[PDB]
């Protein structure tokens, strides 16, 4: 029996948590797939470590604008990642799927809510989905079985600490 | 319009401001699921870049350690807690002994300049239940290498620790499958 897990809120740790569950699952001989809806500038350590173990990663094409005019381009691209996402949510050998930073995809109308939804509902009874990102659709939140709020009690960057490899990316 | 630049300028400035760079303390607290899991994801992220990490776990689970399994071989040392810890008052000596034992190693990692990251998993209940002295932890944290990052995990973390900590995130249980009758599972729960 898989569940839906959502990691949301402003504190640091959502993507990190999705990964640790993924790691945890990989450490149990489990099969996992990852879709990232956002293109980091930097190299991807989680990827670097897990891809070799058998973890598939589909990332968002580079140059996503976040811009109104460009919403068409910007969308195709989203819709293009969402495919792999569709695929993984239909793969029966996949014990777990990570949908990194979907939230904004739904939130800005880039990825239709219904898509995600249906895709979620129709997934393998035994498959676990972990969704992350700030501001997750109320529908999602409701469909979700587990949900955690990373309350921003404190953050290093506020104290003048630069983002650094290993911690931040 | 100019709003765009407005923000543009803001970010740039904020970013421009935060130049410091050293190892930080990170706390993962609250009742919601995700404390231990986010520490490990960060560890994992670190390894992914060649960084060196050391882990200490204050609690010994019922099942196999997926994280350990996966991370040890990459050269991530795991110092775990002995089987049979009682949470029994009657047996505080035995439990305390055990504790202090795991604590050595942690003290060790905390002292190693080679480690870029130290993970003290479920340390909160050790201090909170008096099985381990706070000043100790506070000191160790105080001495540790200046590029070393620590991540502490668990519910109900000493303010002092909270206070020393650089970033703190409290996992609020919006929802939890358990309450909904879902049982614990492999790769997920443990
Ligand atoms: C959360 C966040 C976002 C969210 C913001 C919306 C939301 N809250 O739901 C989303 C995902 C949309 C976003 C996207 C992007 N982000 Co961002 N964002 C973050 C983060 C973690 C928090 C910002 C925040 O909430 N600050 C506090 C609020 C109170 O202050 P604010 O000034 O009003 O914050 C606004 C801006 O930060 C804006 N925004 C968010 N990110 C960025 C990046 C740029 C370049 C700009 C101009 C604006 C922008 O969103 C906030 C709301 O308007 C910061 C991390 C950090 N250390 O700052 C990164 C950060 C600001 N983002 C970063 C990046 C690079 C981007 C993206 C380019 C990511 C990508 N690869 O596509 C895009 C670009 C969007 C844009 N406006 O240009 C960088 C910018 C680097 C730089 N030197 O300019 C930062 C500093 C993170 C990092 N990598 O160090 N991000
Ligand atoms: N509250 C915050 N203040 C500053 N930077 C943040 C904060 N939360 C996350 N970040 C950093 O902003 C980038 C985008 O992270 P995101 O907003 O998706 O948070 P996250 O998923 O919780 O972060 P992380 O991946 O470290 O777990 C990351 O480099 C991340 O570490
Ligand atoms: N609020 C909760 N309800 C039910 N089970 C929980 C809850 N929080 C955590 N768990 C489960 O309890 C065990 C460890 O609990 P802990 O207090 O350390 O939280 P955690 O560090 O956030 O959990 P995890 O390791 O899943 O990320 C795990 O099996 C864990 O998934
Ligand atoms: Mg993230
Ligand atoms: Mg834990």
From Swiss-Prot, chain A:
PANTHER family in the record: CORRINOID ADENOSYLTRANSFERASE
Keyword Transferase: yes
Main location: cytoplasm
Single GO term (MF): corrinoid adenosyltransferase activity
CDD domains registered for this protein in UniProt: CobA_ACA
Keyword Cytoplasm: yes
Catalytic activity, as annotated: 2 cob(II)yrinate a,c diamide + reduced [electron-transfer flavoprotein] + 2 ATP = 2 adenosylcob(III)yrinate a,c-diamide + 2 triphosphate + oxidized [electron-transfer flavoprotein] + 3 H(+); 2 cob(II)alamin + reduced [electron-transfer flavoprotein] + 2 ATP = 2 adenosylcob(III)alamin + 2 triphosphate + oxidized [electron-transfer flavoprotein] + 3 H(+)
Pfam families assigned: CobA_CobO_BtuR
Group of enzyme by EC: transferase
Protein's recorded name: Corrinoid adenosyltransferase CobA
Gene it is expressed from: btuR
Intrachain disulfide bonds: none
GO biological process, any: porphyrin-containing compound biosynthetic process
Record note on disruption phenotype: Mild growth defect on 1,2-propanediol-cyanocobalamin medium; no growth is seen in a double cobA-pduO deletion.
Top-rank lineage group of the source organism: Bacteria
Keywords, in A-Z order: ATP-binding, Cobalamin biosynthesis, Cytoplasm, Nucleotide-binding, Porphyrin biosynthesis, Transferase
Organism annotation: Salmonella typhimurium (strain LT2 / SGSC1412 / ATCC 700720)
Subunit: Homodimer.
InterPro entries named in the record: CblAdoTrfase_CobA (IPR003724), P-loop_NTPase (IPR027417)
Binding site for ATP: 9-15
Record EC number: 2.5.1.17
């Amino acid at each position: 029996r898989g569940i839906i897990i959502v990691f949301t809120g402003n504190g640091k740790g959502k993507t990190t948590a999705a990964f640790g569950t993924a790691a945890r699952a990989v450490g149990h001989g489990k099969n996992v797939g990852v879709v990232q809806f956002i293109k980091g500038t930097w190299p991807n350590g989680e990827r670097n470590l897990l891809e070799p173990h058998g973890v598939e990663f589909q990332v968002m094409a580079t140059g996503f604008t976040w811009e109104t005019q460009n919403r068409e381009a910007d969308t195709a691209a989203c819709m293009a990642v969402w495919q792999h996402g569709k695929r993984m949510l239909a793969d029966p050998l996949l014990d777990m799927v990570v949908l990194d930073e979907l939230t904004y995809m739904v939130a800005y109308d880039y990825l239709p809510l219904e898509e995600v939804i249906s895709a979620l509902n129709a997934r393998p009874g035994h498959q676990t989905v972990i969704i992350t990102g700030r501001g997750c659709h109320r529908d999602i939140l409701d469909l979700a079985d587990t949900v955690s709020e990373l309350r921003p009690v404190k953050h290093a960057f506020d104290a003048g600490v630069k983002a650094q490899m290993g911690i931040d990316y």
